[PDB]
Design an enzyme around this catalytic site. Structure first.
Site, PDB file in Angstrom:
ATOM      1  N   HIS A   1      23.346 -12.185  -1.295  1.00 28.28           N
ATOM      2  CA  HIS A   1      24.429 -11.245  -1.744  1.00 28.28           C
ATOM      3  C   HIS A   1      25.625 -12.026  -2.130  1.00 28.28           C
ATOM      4  O   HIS A   1      26.704 -11.221  -2.774  1.00 28.28           O
ATOM      5  CB  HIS A   1      24.678  -9.962  -1.066  1.00 28.28           C
ATOM      6  CG  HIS A   1      25.549 -10.343   0.178  1.00 28.28           C
ATOM      7  ND1 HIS A   1      25.094 -10.116   1.471  1.00 28.28           N
ATOM      8  CD2 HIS A   1      26.768 -10.587   0.441  1.00 28.28           C
ATOM      9  CE1 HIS A   1      25.883 -10.355   2.490  1.00 28.28           C
ATOM     10  NE2 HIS A   1      27.062 -10.612   1.812  1.00 28.28           N
TER      11      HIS A   1
ATOM     12  N   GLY B   1      34.697 -11.004   5.106  1.00 29.93           N
ATOM     13  CA  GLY B   1      34.666 -12.634   5.016  1.00 29.93           C
ATOM     14  C   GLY B   1      33.761 -13.293   6.274  1.00 29.93           C
ATOM     15  O   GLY B   1      33.722 -14.326   5.950  1.00 29.93           O
TER      16      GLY B   1
ATOM     17  N   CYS C   1      30.718 -12.854   6.648  1.00 32.55           N
ATOM     18  CA  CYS C   1      29.125 -12.884   6.164  1.00 32.55           C
ATOM     19  C   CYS C   1      28.692 -14.467   6.123  1.00 32.55           C
ATOM     20  O   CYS C   1      29.657 -15.316   5.623  1.00 32.55           O
ATOM     21  CB  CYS C   1      28.923 -12.281   4.767  1.00 32.55           C
ATOM     22  SG  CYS C   1      28.986 -10.492   4.981  1.00 32.55           S
TER      23      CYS C   1
HETATM   24  C1  LIG Z   1      30.472 -10.193   4.165  1.00 33.19           C
HETATM   25  O1  LIG Z   1      31.688 -10.935   4.520  1.00 33.19           O
HETATM   26  C2  LIG Z   1      30.536 -10.090   2.529  1.00 33.19           C
HETATM   27  O2  LIG Z   1      29.499 -10.529   2.203  1.00 33.19           O
HETATM   28  N1  LIG Z   1      31.496  -9.963   1.744  1.00 33.19           N
HETATM   29  C3  LIG Z   1      31.207 -10.199   0.231  1.00 33.19           C
HETATM   30  C4  LIG Z   1      30.576  -9.124  -0.639  1.00 33.19           C
HETATM   31  C5  LIG Z   1      31.038  -7.793  -0.297  1.00 33.19           C
HETATM   32  C6  LIG Z   1      30.400  -6.712  -1.227  1.00 33.19           C
HETATM   33  C7  LIG Z   1      29.479  -7.090  -2.176  1.00 33.19           C
HETATM   34  C8  LIG Z   1      29.094  -8.416  -2.556  1.00 33.19           C
HETATM   35  C9  LIG Z   1      29.865  -9.478  -1.680  1.00 33.19           C
HETATM   36  C10 LIG Z   1      30.918  -8.563   4.639  1.00 33.19           C
HETATM   37  C11 LIG Z   1      31.036  -8.485   6.290  1.00 33.19           C
HETATM   38  C12 LIG Z   1      31.376  -6.913   6.656  1.00 33.19           C
HETATM   39  C13 LIG Z   1      32.614  -6.625   5.812  1.00 33.19           C
HETATM   40  C14 LIG Z   1      33.114  -5.118   6.570  1.00 33.19           C
HETATM   41  C15 LIG Z   1      33.465  -5.610   7.818  1.00 33.19           C
HETATM   42  N2  LIG Z   1      32.489  -6.175   8.746  1.00 33.19           N
HETATM   43  C16 LIG Z   1      31.359  -7.066   8.243  1.00 33.19           C
HETATM   44  O3  LIG Z   1      30.700  -7.638   9.020  1.00 33.19           O
HETATM   45  N3  LIG Z   1      29.669  -7.879   4.253  1.00 33.19           N
HETATM   46  C17 LIG Z   1      29.868  -6.778   3.340  1.00 33.19           C
HETATM   47  O4  LIG Z   1      31.016  -6.556   2.838  1.00 33.19           O
HETATM   48  C18 LIG Z   1      28.649  -5.980   2.959  1.00 33.19           C
HETATM   49  C19 LIG Z   1      28.146  -6.460   1.541  1.00 33.19           C
HETATM   50  C20 LIG Z   1      26.636  -5.493   1.377  1.00 33.19           C
HETATM   51  C21 LIG Z   1      26.672  -4.318   1.148  1.00 33.19           C
HETATM   52  C22 LIG Z   1      25.430  -3.559   0.747  1.00 33.19           C
HETATM   53  C23 LIG Z   1      24.412  -3.973   1.544  1.00 33.19           C
HETATM   54  F1  LIG Z   1      23.122  -3.359   1.668  1.00 33.19           F
HETATM   55  C24 LIG Z   1      24.490  -5.423   2.107  1.00 33.19           C
HETATM   56  C25 LIG Z   1      25.621  -6.279   2.131  1.00 33.19           C
HETATM   57  N4  LIG Z   1      29.150  -4.551   3.085  1.00 33.19           N
HETATM   58  C26 LIG Z   1      29.216  -4.027   4.575  1.00 33.19           C
HETATM   59  O5  LIG Z   1      29.083  -4.558   5.448  1.00 33.19           O
HETATM   60  C27 LIG Z   1      29.933  -2.742   4.461  1.00 33.19           C
HETATM   61  C28 LIG Z   1      30.231  -1.621   5.535  1.00 33.19           C
HETATM   62  C29 LIG Z   1      30.750  -0.567   4.808  1.00 33.19           C
HETATM   63  C30 LIG Z   1      31.400   0.588   5.268  1.00 33.19           C
HETATM   64  C31 LIG Z   1      31.621   1.619   4.372  1.00 33.19           C
HETATM   65  C32 LIG Z   1      31.262   1.432   2.930  1.00 33.19           C
HETATM   66  C33 LIG Z   1      30.824   0.255   2.665  1.00 33.19           C
HETATM   67  C34 LIG Z   1      30.449  -0.693   3.361  1.00 33.19           C
HETATM   68  O6  LIG Z   1      30.048  -1.956   3.436  1.00 33.19           O
END
Ligand SMILES: *[C@@](O)(C(=O)NCc1ccccc1)[C@H](C[C@@H]1CCCNC1=O)NC(=O)[C@H](Cc1ccc(F)cc1)NC(=O)c1cc2ccccc2o1
Ligand SMILES: *[C@@](O)(C(=O)NCc1ccccc1)[C@H](C[C@@H]1CCCNC1=O)NC(=O)[C@H](Cc1ccc(F)cc1)NC(=O)c1cc2ccccc2o1
Lengths: 302, 302
Positions: free
Chosen positions: B41, B143, B145
């Protein structure tokens, strides 16, 4: 989200661990530039420990009485000296992995990471606090002496603890990296014991703020307290007195959560008086005191 | 003496963390030999996440769409491929700090260390378990991930987890290093949630043995239980079923303490039925389930 007892990444300290042998005694040392730091009782037999005179014991040793091993390489000792309860062995090679570093003597209530080591080989890393009674509740076996405690700030390693001994209650005592013991302890076998301990109040309050930051509010209430009345209750529960300095330090967490420090104190007073009634906070059924306000800010979302 | 939630020394993994950028998305990657592993992603915008077709999204990218930064050095990407939910970026330089390593897919109930990282820079290390519902209770911010989980055995790093996302309850989900999710989760925004979780029984029993090894026996009793009757009580308290395999695995700790496994089970049954009545075990007021039998043996005196 989430809140864990987090240690600092240990790699910068791993690259500094060596093994030191004198006679039949082997323990760990810390190799920084061309010096190796280790507990001075490396020069002691077991019978020496009853009433050792370390100046007398050390004057009877030469450089070649010390075997320093870094990985698979023997390091040649070219000088030795004693500073308080630490021995400094000057070696002919400067450690190429020496990080930027400082030696710091920490205050009780401060936290640090411990890199547990045996025979110069790191085995695990964990976080702990210097208790108010100047012990630490570590995890240390035979051979762990000379393992160090540290904090890392922007790539500078601040070493604050070197491990010397276990007290009869199973808690641990050691020195700063200049060889001065934390607490009243001495490196000779005596009837010394941990004094009565107290809970680190400012840390408990930091961790309650961590809980709020992570979305838990069940323990809050509508009340406030004076600092004086809070400390009356704290004294009753074997908590450390809370100072205005502590309140100032909790300022940033207060501002981020919108919860005045003295209001969080009223929450803690209610938790001390009624207990938790089967609930948990951040996955704990006890009030946690090993997180400083700085630890919470570092780990938690802003 | 002492018992701490110990992580593995993180240095071997620190030397492998890099930063990966695609478009406006930056996250961490794992640089081993001439390959960089990161969550796929990284190629997604936020609107892409609703219903992404990653094959379609990736076919629209070239090598130069990926910026890999290792410390202060840019790493040139010379190939890219997708394997399940991980992207593999082939770079022109093999990581000189690559440890001996393996990729392992772990079972629920197994523990591992997590090296939390932001922008390719390690920030902390902690221990956790893969829950029975295939989430982990981590500590992860925006950040994080691409941060990885690992175990170390005799200088070989077995990587078992790469971090992808946070679920609505604040627990975390991710994949093995070949990109296969733990649990039913998928990398698209949907209403997916953690399933009901259970306590890891064999781990609780290991930790009770740790407590005995460390000199605490208050919770023991004169009783035994059958495995069947124990599991009847376990089922009632949302504990995982205990298998004969679990009993065999607890063999070595049983032998060291002289406490038959089914006798320790009778102790746990009594603790579940009556609670702790204001006492603690190894400094906890809850029954701890994040230590495997192997963790206890590794950390405890023999
Ligand atoms: C990672 O660091 C990351 O990948 N950031 C880059 C990114 C975000 C969105 C789209 C593309 C790239 C994030 C680590 C999360 C962040 C929140 C706090 N704690 C963590 O571990 N991971 C994300 O942001 C994911 C992206 C994602 C979305 C959907 C999916 F099916 C798989 C991955 N999103 C979340 O972790 C997350 C939590 C949350 C709560 C409410 C609404 C949306 C939401 O997304
Ligand atoms: C260190 O690894 C160490 O230095 N070993 C070498 C050594 C031992 C004795 C004499 C000379 C050299 C030990 C780490 C301890 C070991 C026990 C488990 N957990 C630990 O942290 N440290 C020791 O063995 C000290 C040596 C010492 C003795 C007296 C003194 F004032 C200062 C240091 N001893 C103990 O830690 C210890 C605990 C204990 C319980 C009961 C009886 C004796 C005893 O000693």
């Amino acid at each position: 989200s989430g809140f864990r007892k987090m240690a600092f990444p240990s790699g910068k300290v791993e690259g500094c661990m060596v093994q030191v042998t004198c006679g039949t005694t082997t323990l760990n040392g810390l190799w920084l530039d061309d010096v190796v730091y280790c507990p001075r009782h490396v020069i002691c037999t077991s019978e020496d420990m009853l009433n050792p005179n370390y100046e007398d014991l050390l004057i009877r040793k030469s450089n070649h009485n010390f075997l320093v091993q870094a990985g698979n390489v023997q390091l040649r000792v070219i000088g030795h000296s004693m500073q308080n309860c630490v021995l400094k062995l000057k070696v002919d090679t400067a450690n190429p992995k020496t990080p930027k570093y400082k030696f710091v003597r920490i205050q009780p209530g401060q936290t640090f990471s411990v890199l547990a080591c045996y025979n110069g080989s790191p085995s695990g890393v964990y976080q702990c606090a210097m208790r108010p009674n100047f012990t630490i509740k570590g995890s240390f076996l035979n051979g762990s002496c000379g393992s160090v405690g540290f904090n890392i700030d922007y790539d500078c390693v601040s070493f604050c603890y070197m491990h010397h001994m276990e007290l009869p209650t199973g808690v641990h005592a050691g020195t700063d990296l200049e060889g001065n013991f934390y607490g009243p302890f001495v490196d000779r076998q005596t009837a010394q014991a941990a004094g009565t301990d107290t809970t680190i109040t400012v840390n408990v309050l930091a961790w309650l703020y961590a809980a709020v930051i992570n979305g838990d509010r069940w323990f809050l209430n509508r009340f406030t307290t004076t600092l004086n009345d809070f400390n009356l209750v704290a004294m009753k529960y074997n908590y450390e007195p809370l100072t205005q300095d502590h309140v100032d330090i909790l300022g940033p967490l207060s501002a981020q959560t919108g919860i005045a420090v003295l209001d969080m104190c009223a929450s803690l007073k209610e938790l001390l008086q009624n207990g938790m009634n089967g609930r948990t906070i951040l996955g704990s059924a006890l009030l946690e005191d090993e997180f400083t306000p700085f630890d919470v800010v570092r780990q938690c979302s802003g």
